[PDB]
Amino acid sequence: TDLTEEQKETLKKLKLYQKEYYDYESKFEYELFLLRQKYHDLYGPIYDKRREALVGAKIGTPNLPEFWLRALRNNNTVSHVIEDHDEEILVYLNDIRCDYIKGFILSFYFATNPFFSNSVLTKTYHMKVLLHTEATVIDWYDNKNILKKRDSFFHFFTSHKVEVAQLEMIIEGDYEVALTIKERIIPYAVDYYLGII
Amino acid sequence: TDLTEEQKETLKKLKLYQKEYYDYESKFEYELFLLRQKYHDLYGPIYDKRREALVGAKIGTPNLPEFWLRALRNNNTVSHVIEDHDEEILVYLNDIRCDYIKGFILSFYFATNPFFSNSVLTKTYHMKVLLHTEATVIDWYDNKNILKKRDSFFHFFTSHKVEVAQLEMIIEGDYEVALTIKERIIPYAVDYYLGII
Numbered sequence: 001t002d003l004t005e006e007q008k009e010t011l012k013k014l015k016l017y018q019k020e021y022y023d024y025e026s027k028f029e030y031e032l033f034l035l036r037q038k039y040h041d042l043y044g045p046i047y048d049k050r051r052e053a054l055v056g057a058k059i060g061t062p063n064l065p066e067f068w069l070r071a072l073r074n075n076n077t078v079s080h081v082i083e084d085h086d087e088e089i090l091v092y093l094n095d096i097r098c099d100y101i102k103g104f105i106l107s108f109y110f111a112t113n114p115f116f117s118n119s120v121l122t123k124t125y126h127m128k129v130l131l132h133t134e135a136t137v138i139d140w141y142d143n144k145n146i147l148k149k150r151d152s153f154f155h156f157f158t159s160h161k162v163e164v165a166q167l168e169m170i171i172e173g174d175y176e177v178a179l180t181i182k183e184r185i186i187p188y189a190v191d192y193y194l195g196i197i
Numbered sequence: 198t199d200l201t202e203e204q205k206e207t208l209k210k211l212k213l214y215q216k217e218y219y220d221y222e223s224k225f226e227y228e229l230f231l232l233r234q235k236y237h238d239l240y241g242p243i244y245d246k247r248r249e250a251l252v253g254a255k256i257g258t259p260n261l262p263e264f265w266l267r268a269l270r271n272n273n274t275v276s277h278v279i280e281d282h283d284e285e286i287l288v289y290l291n292d293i294r295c296d297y298i299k300g301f302i303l304s305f306y307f308a309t310n311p312f313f314s315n316s317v318l319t320k321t322y323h324m325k326v327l328l329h330t331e332a333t334v335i336d337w338y339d340n341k342n343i344l345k346k347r348d349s350f351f352h353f354f355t356s357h358k359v360e361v362a363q364l365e366m367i368i369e370g371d372y373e374v375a376l377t378i379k380e381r382i383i384p385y386a387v388d389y390y391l392g393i394i
Binding site for chain 2: 003006007010011013014015017018020021024025027028031032035038039042043046049050053054063064065187188189190191193
């Protein structure tokens with residue numbers, strides 16, 4: 001800008017070097033994408049084996065009753081959004097999975113149950129940093145909508161986009177829960193069940 | 198525990214699968230360590246070239262006056278801890294570098310200056326999650342200790358370990374600054390200088 005010609009040259013050289021930094025950084029970012037994908041695929045079979053052993057019925061994880069409810073209960077962050085009335089519903093939980101959008105999408109698989117007909121409840125987090133969320137609409141059976149009667153874990157399946165403090169607080173807490181399920185509950189489920197974490 | 202023998206078997210299988218998860222996870226963590234090291238070494242020469250072009254004198258970055266002060270100023274987080282009196286000292290800044298402990302260590306290289314004799318001021322962050330910090334003691338020249346006369350950027354070079362809210366707040370803000378310098382200022386210095394971020 002208003003530098004001496006000599007300094008202008010120095011500045012151009014720095015931009016040149018900075019351009020070099022960005023090139024290497026893009027390549028690192030790429031190798032990071034590869035790395036996370038590779039292991040995501042290596043974890044997949046391990047998750048399916050657990051599901052298989054757990055599910056093999058009109059009850060969640062029949063080969064190990066209340067598996068997910070207890071794993072979720074044993075995690076501080078998630079335990080805070082689970083109420084006593086939510087427990088009779090969560091015992092029907094067969095599996096929780098995380099998938100990339102063909103952001104990420106969390107899926108909650110439920111066995112046939114007297115609360116809602118959905119065999120699966122999903123939550124999609126759209127991100128670049130959160131953009132917006134999409135939740136499946138729960139098809140509650142007559143008089144079973146616990147959201148009516150109050151606070152409930154199932155408020156998690158509520159779609160959001162972007163008073164302000166109110167919205168920020170809600171979106172923040174929701175994303176925190178989702179992140180915990182995605183990075184903690186799913187990767188270390190049984191250890192939470194056993195409560196050894 | 199108090200499961201049927203059948204469920205006990207299911208639980209053992211899950212621990213087996215979980216053990217498999219941890220094995221793969223350890224291998225991913227290892228490949229992540231490699232990845233970050235590799236690029237750390239690829240960035241090194243790029244940082245040294247910038248220093249070389251900037252420094253080539255009794256003034257910081259003589260080939261481009263006030264380079265680091267301006268880069269630091271143009272970053273919101275860091276700009277908040279820089280006072281007007283700190284500027285006459287920061288203009289002597291020749292280079293800022295980040296190194297792994299042979300956690301990480303931030304080094305601030307200063308040209309000969311009338312404020313302190315130290316040719317380098319470092320800050321060491323010990324971590325597993327912060328354990329404790331080590332800062333070089335500044336050898337201020339007579340009547341030059343700006344920390345006496347108040348708030349100053351140089352309070353950054355203060356050692357900490359672990360009333361409680363007071364300590365938490367201080368440690369938190371300090372680590373936030375360090376992180377910004379490490380991940381933002383150093384990797385994208387010139388772009389901050391130009392203020393295009």
